[PDB]
Design a protein around this nucleic acid. Structure first.
Lengths: 234, 234
DNA sequence: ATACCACTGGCGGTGATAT
DNA sequence: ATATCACCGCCAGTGGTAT
């Protein structure tokens, strides 16, 4: 493992998405590996290594490549986009957001969760989808809903059955009448409704087949929408 | 040296710049150093030393320590201020082939009927944000569904309950397995999923508590996605 | 609580290799 | 000119040890 390469799976997913796009474009502008190499500050050396997934990319070089590919980043890597994007705020302060945004779904779990940092892309990949005209994301993310926590008793107010999508966003304002998630036992998540009952904090789900946690809960972030998957077609 | 640490003027005193500003604000937000150690994601021995010119910033965490130390890189490293800035143009790119914001909300009825070309419009208003994987490059639209005609049995794959929104784009394949709006006599609708069952093809209420039915009937437009409304939250 | 050290791991690179 | 494999220099970053 100092002898051979590991490289994560979505670490491939990006270099792939890239690969296919390199074919079509050299055509357009008359381009090859060593040519790339030379238009930046290096050799062919890897380059393919990347497309192929032998070496993994430095966002920065990726930031070259796209320019060279006459195209954006999401088209090949979005996670990068977020990264880059982020690093900008650093300069002049403001999220223009423009059109798309991004942010992931992850392997349904707390990923340590915020307050402390997130280890970037982290153990989870889930390829991350995005697109409904999107708002302030901060440290957001989509999540698939597994546990039937709230599943409206068959035509009630709202819903949230299996496989559907909720959206985390943790840099949020969490109040009564609102949907959200909180923390339990140091480990547990559960995605629920927030209520001041007889004047206290409760978590009820739209799913009576279920109970209701009351002191020791701490909210975590305010779920903003649902979308469903896409898989719904294929 | 190279058995030691390679020294280059600015390629050093940038961090100075940093720590210099650091101590002035260091206690004014609420931070030690073990605080930079954490939050960032790397040891204190690790955090603390860079600043001594002992380590050169990568473009990365560069951008971190500003959404912390309430600055703007160039405020301490324009050398990298530069570096980050010309990667956003990598991400800036252009109004691509995927959306600004699309179709409306509508009280069901006649969707125009693509028996000719589909003619629409008997009010005009809507109030509809929100986008998708751009499709609907002809005639498509949102839809709000009252009727349990899909609400899955309690614990179940797909669902679609009440007044949860959904997207049609007839300009499209549209076949058994995909979810589809349809009507009869050129009048009705309750719409269902389509199936390949022997002796003709039919539409299955995704509430098997519902009667299910099929020559005289027609298959106008196609569902591809469905999300909860914006404000069904906040 | 921060400044300082002897160490290393697995990415970011060249350079010659079989299809 | 596309995939490819046997090796090194390398600096961000770390675990003890101090202050």
């Amino acid at each position: 493992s100092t002898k051979k390469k590991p490289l994560t799976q979505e670490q491939l997913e990006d270099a792939r998405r890239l690969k296919a796009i390199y074919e079509k474009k050299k055509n357009e502008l008359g381009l090859s590996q060593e040519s790339v190499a030379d238009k930046m500050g290096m050799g062919q050396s890897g380059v393919g290594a990347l497309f192929n997934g032998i070496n993994a990319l430095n966002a920065y070089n990726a930031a070259l490549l796209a320019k060279i590919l006459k195209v954006s980043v999401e088209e090949f890597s979005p996670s990068i986009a977020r990264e880059i994007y982020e690093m900008y705020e650093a300069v002049s302060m403001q999220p223009s957001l423009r059109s798309e945004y991004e942010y992931p779904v992850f392997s349904h779990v707390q990923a340590g969760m915020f307050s402390p940092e997130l280890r970037t892309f982290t153990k989870g990949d889930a390829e991350r989808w995005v697109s409904t005209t999107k708002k302030a994301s901060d440290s957001a993310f989509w999540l698939e809903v597994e546990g039937n926590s709230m599943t409206a008793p068959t035509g009630s107010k709202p819903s949230f059955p299996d496989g559907m999508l909720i959206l985390v966003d943790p840099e949020q304002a969490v109040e009564p009448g609102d949907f959200c998630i909180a923390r339990l036992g140091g480990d547990e998540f559960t995605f629920k409704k927030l209520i001041r009952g007889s004047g206290q904090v409760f978590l009820q789900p739209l799913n009576p087949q279920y109970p209701m946690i009351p002191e020791s809960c701490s909210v975590v972030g305010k779920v903003i929408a649902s979308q469903w998957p896409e898989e719904t077609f294929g």
